Nucleic acid binder design. Structure first.
Length: 667
RNA sequence: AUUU
């Protein structure tokens, strides 16, 4: 009933690239964007379901976003600033998602930036050579400052004194400077011996600093307290970030080894007293280092804390209980592949370019983002996935290095791996009946080099057969076989279609892959073939076959006549049954609606997905939410109006045809 | 230090 977005992962090793304002709104830098998430009653979630929603994106930087900071000035919580490896500092208005103004004053990679808690239009940024800019965005003024010739890691403007800024460097140096006196160093805080977070005591000073040296140091405007991180059982090097809660100044929250969060008790100074977050609940803690911690006080006054992590989860912590309220997962690579299980309805496998398979339990009642990760034996970009049609938990996958594997997602065992590799990327995986020389279902894998292998899913480490030998023998072929780029079995298991590099599609019949038809329609490499399902209103529809190539135009063919005549010599088809025009770039994926007769969705490099009434050649609905090139699409199993798509923007969107404003792709 |  509402959209969802699995977004790109929060950027790593950035001291402040996420922030939140009251009510409220969380933003996080991810790749070249900032993603915005409404949190609390304003998200409008059912009681029990986590009160967050992904609501927007700040689009316009051309390289990695390294910094993000909201304004914390009442009445302008809608303003925020970003830094980027594109060299710019931008001021944005999240109401319109547009740039207010920006500068390109830095000449070296920007490290971070901070919006002044005291001056309404002042943003202070710092770079890898040590240069600092003060930017008063709303009066067109700026000032460069240069304190020490060292790489800035972090910077925090005082909450109390408008001229005072603390800066932390790569080498462990910390300084408090006065920006009204050309950045004069007012205090040099000597103590740390490796990379510097800086949090000021929220009552009027003390500063706390967190370091790669595994210490938190609390200083006076001289050191007053050194806290070494504890070594705890597990359940990269350290990143040590801090949140000093403004309403509980005797508490200090830190990250720790492995992404554990601690609440330190500053009253019990000496004894290094802390309380571990999530200490009761099992497996809700982060599993890798935490980079940023952002407090968010909701309008119903719940105190929350958002964490970002190298584990690719964003977690929301309830400060009253220190338990995890909810988790938003994210993706660290292209979304190459989507596959829904026929056995466990709603179980959605996603093949991602960060080397981890995701299985999204899409129908989870109380969680819109119930995602589990599978990393064992994967280790490269997962470019193809296909669930077994009847065996629960059985997930085939393929990779950009030619590897084919079989997961049991109901176990914790590493997957079985095929001993035979493809030379190139595994494009497609499909189950179907075995064919000679193999002896219920075989696994078929098509690689970019053009071979389709038949694997025995019980003996994966055994022999896998190039099906071209059977095709050659059964059809008495003398010349070299086409370079196969796609495989798709008809739903009855009786006909295999191969799509080829030269654009042709070939139709083969069991048992021996006798060729019965060649379709010559596409003039470029075939990327996707899909056969219509068998549960529509007329049996004729199971003969419909949609296909897409590196050209924009989609075809449907109707293979009833040829299949039913079982010819002794093959037929050539050169006219389409239906033609679907509208896209403006290559077609990566086509899928038929299981809820309708003759309804198709297509994904394109044009950045859109299109829903078609294929039988009337009528475009119905065009989705434009992705920023990237779409690679995969799949209809939701229970909602006729809901479709999932994945793209090279590192996003998976779940979207509703009823909420989309266009009927056809951009011209 | 991942972001094709």
């Amino acid at each position: 009933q509402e959209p969802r977005t699995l977004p790109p992962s929060p950027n790593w090793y950035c001291a402040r690239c996420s922030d939140a304002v009251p009510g409220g709104l969380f933003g996080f830098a991810a790749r070249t964007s900032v993603f915005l998430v409404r949190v609390g009653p304003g998200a409008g979630e059912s009681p029990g379901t986590p009160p967050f929603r992904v609501i927007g994106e700040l689009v316009g930087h051309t390289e990695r976003v390294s910094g993000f900071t909201f304004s914390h000035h009442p009445g302008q919580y809608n303003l925020c600033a970003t830094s980027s490896d594109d060299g710019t500092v931008k001021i944005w208005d999240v109401e319109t998602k547009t740039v207010v103004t920006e500068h390109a004053l830095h000449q070296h990679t920007i490290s971070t930036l901070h919006w002044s808690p005291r001056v309404k239009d002042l943003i202070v940024s710092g770079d890898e050579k040590g240069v600092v800019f003060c930017y008063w965005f709303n009066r067109n003024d700026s000032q460069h400052l240069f304190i020490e010739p060292r790489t800035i890691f972090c910077l925090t403007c005082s909450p109390h004194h408008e001229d005072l800024v603390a800066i932390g460097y790569k080498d462990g140096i910390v300084v408090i400077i006065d920006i009204s006196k050309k950045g004069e160093v007012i205090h040099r805080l000597r103590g740390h011996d490796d990379e510097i977070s800086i949090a000021w005591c929220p009552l009027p000073c003390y500063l706390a600093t967190g370091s790669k040296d595994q210490t938190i140091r609390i200083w006076s405007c001289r050191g007053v307290m050194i806290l070494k991180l504890p070594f705890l059982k597990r359940r990269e090097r350290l990143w040590l970030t801090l949140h000093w809660p403004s309403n509980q100044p005797t508490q200090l929250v830190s990250s720790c080894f492995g992404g554990e969060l601690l609440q330190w008790d500053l009253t019990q100074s000496w004894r290094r007293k802390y309380t571990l977050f999530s200490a009761s609940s099992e497996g809700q803690n982060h599993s890798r280092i935490v980079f940023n911690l952002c407090p968010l006080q909701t309008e119903d006054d719940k105190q929350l804390l958002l964490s970002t992590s190298m584990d690719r989860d964003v977690k929301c912590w309830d400060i009253a209980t220190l338990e995890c309220s909810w988790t938003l997962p994210s993706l660290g690579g292209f979304a190459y592949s989507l596959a829904f299980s026929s056995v466990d309805i709603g179980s959605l496998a996603i093949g991602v370019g960060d080397g981890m398979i995701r299985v999204w339990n899409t129908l989870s009642i109380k969680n819109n983002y119930d995602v589990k990760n599978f990393w064992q034996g994967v280790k490269s970009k997962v470019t193809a996935l296909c669930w077994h049609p009847t065996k629960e938990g059985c997930l085939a996958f393929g990779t950009d290095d030619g590897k084919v594997g079989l997961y049991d997602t109901y176990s914790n065992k590493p997957p079985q791996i095929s001993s035979t590799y493809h030379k190139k990327t595994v494009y497609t995986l499909a189950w179907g009946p075995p064919v000679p020389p193999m002896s219920s279902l075989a696994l078929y894998s098509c690689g970019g080099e053009g071979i389709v292998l038949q694997h025995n899913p019980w003996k994966l480490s055994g022999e896998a057969f190039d099906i071209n030998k059977l095709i050659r023998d059964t059809n008495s072929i003398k010349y070299k076989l086409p370079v196969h780029t796609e495989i798709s079995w008809k739903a009855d298991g009786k006909i295999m279609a191969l799509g080829n590099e030269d654009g042709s599609i070939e139709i083969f019949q069991i048992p021996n892959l006798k060729l019965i038809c060649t379709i010559q329609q596409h003039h470029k490499l075939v990327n996707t073939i899909s056969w219509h399902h068998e549960h529509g209103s007329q049996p004729e529809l199971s003969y419909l076959m949609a296909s897409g190539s590196n050209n924009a135009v989609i075809y449907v063919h109707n293979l009833k006549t040829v299949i039913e005549s079982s010819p002794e010599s093959p037929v050539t088809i050169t006219e389409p049954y239906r033609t679907l025009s509208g896209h403006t770039a290559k077609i990566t994926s086509v899928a038929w609606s299981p809820h309708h007769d003759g309804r198709l969705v297509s994904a394109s490099y044009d950045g859109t997905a299109q829903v078609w009434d294929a039988l009337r050649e009528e475009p119905l609905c065009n989705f434009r939410g992705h920023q990237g090139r779409l690679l995969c699409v799949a209809w939701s199993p229970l909602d006729p109006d809901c479709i999932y798509s994945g793209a090279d923007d590192f996003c998976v969107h779940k979207w509703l045809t009823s909420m989309q404003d266009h009927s056809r792709p951009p011209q």
